[PDB]
Ligand binder design. Structure first.
Ligand code: ZN
Ligand code: ZN
Ligand code: ZN
Length: 73
């Protein structure tokens, strides 16, 4: 099937309920995190740790420089 991309590309309102992760290599901790896809693609081998499930949007995909590797381009 398709290759799932960053949940930011499908977050149609500001937030969406989902599992999300911390990346200590990128110091994206606390209130900052990444979706299930970006933990596996953009932060592969990047000292990832489960955060929680809840209301969230992905800070990897949202980054304005477009450096997320899991966007539609
Ligand atoms: Zn993402
Ligand atoms: Zn990282
Ligand atoms: Zn990403």
């Amino acid at each position: 099937g398709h290759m799932k991309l960053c949940t930011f590309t499908i977050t149609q309102k500001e937030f969406m309920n989902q599992h999300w992760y911390h990346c200590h290599t990128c110091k994206m901790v606390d209130g900052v995190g990444v979706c299930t896809v970006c933990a596996k693609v953009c932060h592969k081998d990047h000292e990832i740790s489960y955060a929680k499930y809840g209301s969230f949007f992905c800070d990897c995909g949202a980054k304005e420089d477009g450096s997320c590797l899991a966007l539609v381009k």
